[PDB]
Every structure is written in C-alpha cells, then in structure tokens.
Paper text:
Tripartite motif (TRIM) family proteins are RING-type E3 ligases that play key regulatory roles in innate immune signalling pathways that lead to the induction of a type I interferon (IFN) response and production of inflammatory cytokines through activation of the IRF3 and NF-κB transcription factors. Activation of RIG-I initiates a signalling cascade that depends on the E3 ligase activity of [name] and induces the production of IFNs and inflammatory cytokines. An example is non-structural protein 1 ([name]) of influenza A viruses (IAV), a multifunctional virulence factor that binds many host proteins during infection, including TRIM2527–29. To understand [name]-mediated inhibition of [name] activity on a molecular level we have determined crystal structures of the CC domain of [name] in complex with [name]-FL and the isolated ED, and of a [name] CC-[name] fragment, which includes the RIG-I-recognition domain of [name].
Residue numbers in the entry:
A (entry chain B): 188 to 358, 434 to 629
B (entry chain A): 189 to 360, 436 to 629
Amino acid sequence: MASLSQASADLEATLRHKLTVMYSQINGASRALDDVRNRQQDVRMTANRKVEQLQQEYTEMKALLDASETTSTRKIKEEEKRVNSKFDTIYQILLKKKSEIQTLKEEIEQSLTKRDEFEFLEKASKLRGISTKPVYIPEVELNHKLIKGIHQSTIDLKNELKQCIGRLQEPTSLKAKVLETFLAKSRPELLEYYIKVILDYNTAHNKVALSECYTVASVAEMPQNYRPHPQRFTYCSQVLGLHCYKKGIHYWEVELQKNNFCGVGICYGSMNRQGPESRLGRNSASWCVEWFNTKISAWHNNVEKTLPSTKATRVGVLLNCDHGFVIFFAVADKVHLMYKFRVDFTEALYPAFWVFSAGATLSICSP
Amino acid sequence: ASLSQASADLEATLRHKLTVMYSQINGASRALDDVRNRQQDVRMTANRKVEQLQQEYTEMKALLDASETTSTRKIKEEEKRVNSKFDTIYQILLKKKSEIQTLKEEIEQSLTKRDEFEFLEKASKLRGISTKPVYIPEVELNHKLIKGIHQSTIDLKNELKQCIGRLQEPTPLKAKVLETFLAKSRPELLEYYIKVILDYNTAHNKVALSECYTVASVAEMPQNYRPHPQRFTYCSQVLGLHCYKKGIHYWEVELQKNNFCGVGICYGSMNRQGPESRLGRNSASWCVEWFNTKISAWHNNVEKTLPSTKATRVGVLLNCDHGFVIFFAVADKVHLMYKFRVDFTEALYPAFWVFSAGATLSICSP
C-alpha cells in the first residue's frame, strides 16, 4: 500500500537475511557430512579393536593346545625311552654272555690243534667240566594301556571341544500413443528405467519404522520419537522418498507384506504434511493406490475408484515426466495392470507410502 | 689204561660241546638281532601314536579356525550394517544440502537485477520459502551383541582350560700304593669309575631288579625268573655284569633301609647253590654286611665286627694291578670302613645281598 524504493528495500533487507541464514544452514550441513564419515571411521576402528580382542582370545586357546600337545608327547617319548633304554641294557647283558661263550669255544678250538701231545689229554681234562647254557631275554613289554589312554583322552578332547564350539554358535496424439506402448511392456523393459528409492527419515510419521539402509518401512508399536520437523507427518502414518522427479522416465518396485491397511503412490513436494488433509489421496497433490480391509482402491483428490482385488504383493510404479503419466502394476510372475493416471504434472514428484495395520511392511525391491 | 682210546674219548666228547657251542652262539646272535628289531618295533609304534595325536590336535586347531572366522564374520556384518546406513544417511544429507544450495542461488540470481520493477514481482514468491537445518538420527552400534560374542569366546577359553585339565589329571711297593689310595679324596677315587650293571641271570628269585638293571631290592612274591646255573638258589643275592682281573676300578652303591643288606666282590668260580654260596662264607668272596644295623666285614666264615656309621653310600675300590680291595663310607667326606690285602687268583665280579623287606641297593653314577 506504498512505494517503489521502500518495497525494493523491504524485499532486499528480509531477502539477504534468509541468504545469510542459508550460508550457516549449508555450512551446518557440511559439518554433518564430515561428522558421518568421521563416525564411520570411528566404528571401523571399534570393529578392528573387537576383532583383535578375539584374535588374542583365540591365540590364547591355540597356545593352550600347544602346551597339552607337547605335554602328552613328552609322556609317550618317556615311556619309549624307558623301554628302549632297557633294551640297550639287555643288549649289553646278552653281549657279555656271548663273548663269554665265544671264549670257551676258542679255548677248546686252540686245545684241539695239538693232538700230537700226550698233554692234549692233560690240557683238556680240566675243560671237561665246563658247560655253557643258552641266553634268555626277559618280559620287556611296552605299556599299551597308558598310550591308548592318552590317545583316548585326546580323542575325547576333540569331541568335548566340538561340544563347546557348538555352544558358542548355537545361542495428445503423441502422448496417448506412448501411453499404450508403456502399458503393453514386459517386466524386463520396465526395469530399464529403474531408480533405487530411498526412504527419508525427515518425512516419516512417529509410528512409522524405517530400516535396512532406509529401504523398509513398517508399523511401529511404540511412538519412535523422531525430531519435530516441518516435513514430518503429524496426523497420518506416512513417509516419502528421498528424491523427487520432474524430468525423464522412472520406475520402482515395492513389496507389500500383510496387504491389509497400506498404500503406495506419488506426491508433490508442496503437499501439506499436517492435519487430516495431509492424508494421501485426499488432496490435489497426491495420486496413490490403497488397501483398506484387503479391498483395492485408486485415489486422487477425495475420489475412490474401487479396483479388482489381486493376488500379487509386489507393486511396480512407473512415472513419465517427459509426456505425463503414472502407471501402477501388479507383479507376481507376469506384469498385470492395476491403474493409470493421465496428468500433465505441475512440479516434481516424490514417491509416497502409507502403512497402518500393525504388521504391514513396504520394502523397496532391487531385482 | 690206554692212549689213543683216551685221546679219542676226549676228542669225541670235546667236539660234541664245540658243536653245541656253535648253536649256542648262533642262538645268541639271533637274540641280539631280535632285541634291536624289537627296539625298532617300539620306535615305530611311538611315532604312529605320536602322529595319531598330531592329527587329533590339528583337527582341534582347525575347529578353532572355523569358529574364529565364524565369529569374525558376525562382527563385520554388524559393522557393514551400521557403516552402510551412514553411506545412506550421507546421501540423505547430501540431497538436503544441494536442495538448500538451489534456493540460495535462486535468491542470489534474483538480487542481481534490482534495476527492475519486477525485482519485486519475481521475488514476491520467494518470500514464503523457509529452509530448515539437517539432522542425523540415532545410529548406535549394537554393543550387547558384540560383548555377548566376546563373553562366549571368553567362556570357551575357560571351558577349554577345564577339559585340557581332564586330559592330564586322570593319567598321573704294594704297601706304599695302598696307603696312597687309602688317603685319597672322593674326586680322586671317581677317576677310576665304572658303571656297574646288574645281571638278571644271577639274581635270586626274591631279588627284584630295575631302572636299566641298576637298582636291586627285596621282592614280596617270588619273581620266577628262568632256571640258570648262575642263579642263586639258597640266598638272596645278585652279581655284576662285568668281571675285572686287570687295572683299577671303583663304584658307588646307595643303601636304603640299611638293616639286612651287604656289598662286596666275588670270584666267578664261586658256587651259587646251597648255604655255602652265601657271601662271606667261602674262599671266593669278600664283602661288608649289615645285620640288625651292625656292620661286619666278612671273608671265608670270619667276622670283623666294625663300628656303625651314619653314611648310606658305600664306595668300593679294587686294584687288580697290585692286589687290594677297599670299602669306604660316603656321606660328604670319604670315611674308611675296611680293606683287604690279597693277590687275587682270578677275575672278580661285584656282589650284592639284600634281605630285609624294604632294603634297596642302587648304583650311583655322579
């Protein structure tokens, strides 16, 4: 209700005020980007420290077996040396008795040579009395019971160890023509335009649980208590994708377990996140398909198209920003058709997801 | 009363013994081989039972290499789980950055043309835009799981320690030289040492032999060795393996429970049977003897009742070159028990007697 230079100034002044805050927002993000990569290294070392902590503990056990291994071996070589040393003795005992009898042999063999003599009789009359006797070796048996007992205890230790290792591990003219082409395509042709959808933790409602590198959304039993945020849903149990699309062709698949109270779709970034109006299908900025008591319905702007119920529980969604259509498919083996929308879109679209029945779960597919 | 017939009656029965002695000697030669073969027989049985354990321990070593990698995989999975979520959240933050970077440039572009009237119009829509700062959610590493693996691995170490214990616990001028030798010290006497070996042929049925045949002791039951001419039948005696007729010799004997036992020397000719075989009671045996802890030197049924002594190691010295045998008492120093001055007729074997159920004679090898 005024002038030029003052309006130019009233703009310019409050305009750069936001620019100066955006610097500190962006540098506030840049710090958080660094904190994450630092925190990855922080964990990477904590892994190695707990691994090296086990590499010690296993080497302690490995050395304990090297003790017992030598300790049982010593025992066997002692029993070996005991017996083999007795043979080294008995060999010497026999050896003496041999050369003893070898002498009396030669004493007789020498005396026989001179049978010229009369005193052949005299020199051998004393030799009549000598009478040698044969050698003998006593009972030298190796202790089998002791050596079989060690082996048996060592066999027992192997199957005692096996027991305890288990106890560790066990516990329009062009536009319409292109639509028809895409409507008739097969699963491999649709998968050429794939993009890995990522869930956004900013967007997820308090009772929506996110997991598996933020690719699995499900119903929470308790409120998860995320931070308050403008982009977070306050009324309805909803969550959005990370990336939005205004140019090109896109496709993604979603697996829906316990298909009872859940829904998949697309949404403009402008859609309000708060109040009952934020609910998907009930405004001008959201197109989706939805299950309610296992009855399939396509929704947009408070309008219900009650569809035929289907077997499949993998929903493939295709989007064409170049021409202007979004298509919903049912996938079990083949590609069945659920519904389509013919729209020239105003702005970029984020993928959109809803889940309500305590059990339902939406998962991004990457085949 | 004839020559050639006596020469023949000798010659005939003489070579009969010679021909038997061949078969005796070849009968020994076989036994010499049997022993050395039986040593090898045991030596392989040792290695086979050792190699049998070397397998069994390596089986256990590999079992730990499995669990070691199996628990490590589990930790690296929990690492990758968390680090992959950061790789996501980095991309989530990255989008929110460039999102706000755009609206910055949209505003920075619009400021340049403040010449225009439509500076107001083109930035009136830009008034409403309001960016908000980033946030990182709770990404905490599962400590309970990693401490639990470590605790079970600590438990396995002390479970193993338990069972390694269960392996090992259940298996539990003549006159002038005499005087010189009489005055010698223990190191000088030990220069003429010879390791005495007991002879199993000689030992009486109630005399037990052990420790590579160097320890004689009283048997409780009759040991029932083979019958042999050289074995004692009456008295509890045993002799040495080697006999000595030339040179100087020495040996030490430890006598536990010195009550009814005795040490000495003996000629090979001594008869082993009957009461006469007893050591000290004939012309072929010299010895020292304990009877009710009273020391006596004996030879040919003659007693010299000596002074009782403290020591229980008897050192015996023999001099075949000159002709004397000496008995010493040894505890720390070398005390003298008795001597014999004899020009010996033939070679001497060391000789030993034990009778009190408990007494034990052991050869010392310092």
